[PDB]
Amino acid sequence: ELVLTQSPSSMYASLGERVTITCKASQDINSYLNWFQQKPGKSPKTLIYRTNRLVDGVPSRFSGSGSGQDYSLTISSLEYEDMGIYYCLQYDEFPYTFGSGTKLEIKRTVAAPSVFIFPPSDEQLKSGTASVVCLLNNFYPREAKVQWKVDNALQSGNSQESVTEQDSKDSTYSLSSTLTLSKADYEKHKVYACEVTHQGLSSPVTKSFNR
Amino acid sequence: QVQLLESGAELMKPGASVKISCKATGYTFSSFWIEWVKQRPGHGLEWIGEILPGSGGTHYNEKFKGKATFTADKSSNTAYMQLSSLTSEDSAVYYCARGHSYYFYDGDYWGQGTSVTVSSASTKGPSVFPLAPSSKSTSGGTAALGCLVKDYFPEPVTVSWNSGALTSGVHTFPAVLQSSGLYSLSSVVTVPSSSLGTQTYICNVNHKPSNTKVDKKVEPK
C-alpha cells in the first residue's frame, strides 16, 4: 500500500531555532496529509490537517506545506513543548497509511551528571535479593558510561539501565543503573562503587559505600 | 467539549479476546467516522480501520480483517473494537480517534489510549521500597531521594510525590522487564539537601492491574 517516507527519523534543533521535517509519499496523495505530534507517555494529537490547514488552538509557530508526493512541517521557533515524535498520514487511498515518524530532539549545552548511589533498603533485603541503585541526574548528551564495582570487582551482566527522555526543564537526560544480586552474594562483599564517565566531566566520578 | 474516553488497561491470555470501548461526547456520534490505531513499542502508529456509527459502515485495513471487529452503540454514543484470538503481536496501546464527516472536519480528536497485554502470567502488585537520600554533602548542594517499584505485572503503573504537590525535579524511569518476567522502575526526586528533616516526602505508586496503591515515605539516616 501507499508508503509514507519520513527521513531523518531523528532531527535536532535548539530552542528558538526554526526546524522543518518532511514526509515523502510514494504517489500524488492530492494534499491529503495530516500531521500528528506524539509526546512521550501521551497519545498522538493532530496539528495540521489536509497538508496546510492548521488545527484550532495550535501554536502559529506551526505551519504545513507540500503537494504531490512532497509535504513538510515547519516550526518557526522551537520551544521545549514541541519535543516529541511527528507522524504524517495519508487519507488519499485506503488503507490510510502512516509515516514512520521523526523524533524531534533538542540540542543544548553539554552537562555533567550528578551521580547518586543508593543502597539496598533494610525493608527490601528482608526478602530475597538486594538492589543497589545508581543515579545520573540532569546531564547532556545522553552518551554516558556506568560501571559497577563490588570490592573493585568490575561487575558484569547483573546491571540494568533505563534513561528518561529530555526533561522539559532543561532538555537533559537522566539515567538509572540497577545492580541486582541475592542477599547472600550481597553480604559477601563490602564496597559497592558506581563509576560514571561523561564528556562533561574532567575525569570519571565514583560513588560507593560500605555495608 | 468533544472528548473520547477509552476503557481501562487490560491483560488477557493468548487465544482469548478483548473489547475496548470509546465513549464519544460533545458532538453528533453518528455522523463522524471513528478511526482505530495500534501502537507497538517499535512500530509507531498503525491504522486498524474506521467505523461510521450512524450507517455502521466500516473500512478495515486488510492486515486486521478478522482480527479486529468494530461496533457502535448509538444510544450510548460508544464505539467498540474487539481484538480476537489474541497473541503477543496484539500487545499494544490502542487509540480511537474522531475523523471526518461529510458536512464537516477541522482536524481529529484522539482517545487517551488503552493498553492491552497478552500474557499467561497473573497480575502482580508492585513492592515499593525507599531510595533513602544519602546525606549528600560531598561537595555539591542538594540531595536526591526516590522510590523503587519492584516486581509488578503488567506494564501500567504510576508514581507521584506528596500527591503531585511537589513535582519539582521528579524523574520516573521507563519500566524495565526483568529475567523473572516482572517489571520494575524507579522514581527519584532531587530536593534542597537542606529541608529534609523539616519536610518529608511520600511517593504515591498506584498500579491499576491489581488495584494496588502505596504511599511510602522516605527518611534520611
Ligand SMILES: O=C(O)CCCNC(=O)c1ccc([C@H]2CC[C@H](c3ccccc3)C[C@@H]2O)cc1
Ligand atoms: O470538498 C472536498 O472535496 C474536500 C473535503 C472532503 N474531505 C474528505 O474527503 C476527508 C476524507 C478523510 C479524512 C480523514 C483524515 C485522517 C483522519 C485520521 C485521524 C487519526 C488517525 C487516522 C486517520 C480521519 C479522517 O476521516 C478527512 C477528510
